[PDB]
Design a protein that fits this description.
The structure is a homodimer.
Chain A lengths: L3 E6 L2 E9 L2 E5 L5 E2 L2 H4 L4 E3 L4 E5 L18 E5 L2 E6 L2 E5 L11 E3 L5 E10 L3 E10 L2 E5 L5 E2 L1
The structure holds octyl beta-D-glucopyranoside (2 copies).
């Protein structure tokens, strides 16, 4: 728990919240409470449009936040469970690398810069196209491939 | 096609050569002739130390050369068959992504800069660690996992 924190609901980890820039971010559909009391007590706003819940990072934690970038060249990226391909405007991963529970994990570049947050994914056989919140032309956007389930 | 070229021997593609910086580079152990008349007629110098054959890229082709860098932060990089992981000072791939014939293919970062050239691989189970040529600013280096086999 430095920039990524478990969200828990009735004992079970249902997802993750992430510190990015000056925001605390969590997928809105992820049920439960962030298992950090400094975070859990913040003013959070829900946006259905982005499936995001956000709060201002507290003063004593601002410097723990992840760096981010709007720039995502086509290629491969990182998340907790391995490689993530970006091409065609879609993020994809090996099917099974991700499952219900991974919602909230960030996708980041080689310099540790967050480029997207994972919301869920659509099984397309061998690969899974991720549902994500990200920046397109520096504008916040939720991208959902057809047939995606919330994670 | 642009920066990558087939090497053929007695009809079969055996491997590849690539334009990098101001050099035509090719794994020395890869048999055959570069399937490009403008390149096959160059003066080639062979280094057994690096399993490299090199020549100066012709003038009318120097801008077709991709850039290269020494910068290798841990994470994922790109090659023709998918994602290449760099970590612990080693490049690895999912076993079965590479095979004899892949020697000479370059590994790129998201900026499209070459960070390594594939020489072969060592099957280590789920993953295969690549034998490569790679850079340290102005010096070149052969990195070879134990029991690697030439591709
Ligand atoms: C890598 C160490 O760092 C931290 O490790 C924590 C423990 O799992 C994770 O929760 C955090 O995501 C990570 O930042
Ligand atoms: C292996 C990928 O081959 C690519 O082909 C592209 C178009 O021909 C060019 O950018 C280069 O030749 C090469 O990067």
């Amino acid at each position: 728990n430095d920039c990524i924190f478990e969200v828990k609901h009735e004992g079970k980890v249902t997802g993750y919240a992430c510190l990015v820039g000056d925001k605390v971010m969590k997928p809105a559909h992820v049920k439960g409470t962030i298992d950090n009391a400094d975070l859990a007590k913040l003013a959070f706003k829900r946006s259905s449009k982005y499936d995001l819940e956000c709060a201002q990072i507290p003063v004593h934690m601002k410097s723990d936040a992840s760096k981010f970038t709007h720039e995502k060249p086509e290629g491969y990226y990182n998340w907790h469970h391995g490689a993530v391909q970006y091409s065609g405007g879609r993020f994809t991963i090996p099917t099974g690398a991700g499952k219900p529970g991974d919602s909230g994990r960030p996708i980041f570049d080689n310099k540790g810069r967050v480029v997207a947050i994972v919301l869920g994914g659509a099984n397309e056989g061998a690969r899974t196209a991720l549902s994500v919140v990200t920046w397109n032309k520096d504008i916040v956007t939720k991208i959902t491939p057809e047939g995606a389930e919330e994670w």
